[PDB]
């Protein structure tokens, strides 16, 4: 059991760590364009803010699946039951 349990900690760190890395860079790109449009046309902000949340759902979709699988591998373990 020792190496399967030790390698499950690294598997969880890669799932949450790569997800945290991508989501921070992704929102930095999407966010900068929201502020740029908002500064040029301050009347458009109500529309642009709603359109940003439609993209934010697509951007985090696979990252949240990764965090869901990482919590499952932490509080339960599908590999330990396979010896």
């Amino acid at each position: 059991m020792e190496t399967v349990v030790g390698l499950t900690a690294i598997a969880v760190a890669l799932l949450i760590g790569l997800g945290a890395l991508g989501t921070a860079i992704g929102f930095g790109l999407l966010g900068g364009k929201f502020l740029e449009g908002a500064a040029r046309q301050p009347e458009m902000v109500p529309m642009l803010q709603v359109k940003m949340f439609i993209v934010a759902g697509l951007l985090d979709a696979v990252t949240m699946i990764g965090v869901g699988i990482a919590l499952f591998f932490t509080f339960a373990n599908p590999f330990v039951g396979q010896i």
């Binding site: 040029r40 046309q41 301050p42 009347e43």
Partner: protein, 48 residues
């Protein structure tokens, strides 16, 4: 001469060269645009 009315022409001298919440999407740089528009403005005043 300036047209005051059909019976009065006034001689005049007018200065040509020495002249709010949103901004334009300047296609070329704004400096390049200002250089061309000031020239079109002075020519139009001379034509008028």
């Amino acid at each position: 001469n300036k047209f005051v009315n059909t019976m009065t022409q006034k001689p005049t001298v007018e200065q040509l060269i020495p002249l709010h919440h949103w901004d334009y999407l300047y296609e070329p740089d704004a400096k390049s645009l200002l250089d061309g528009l000031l020239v079109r403005y002075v020519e139009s005043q001379v034509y008028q």
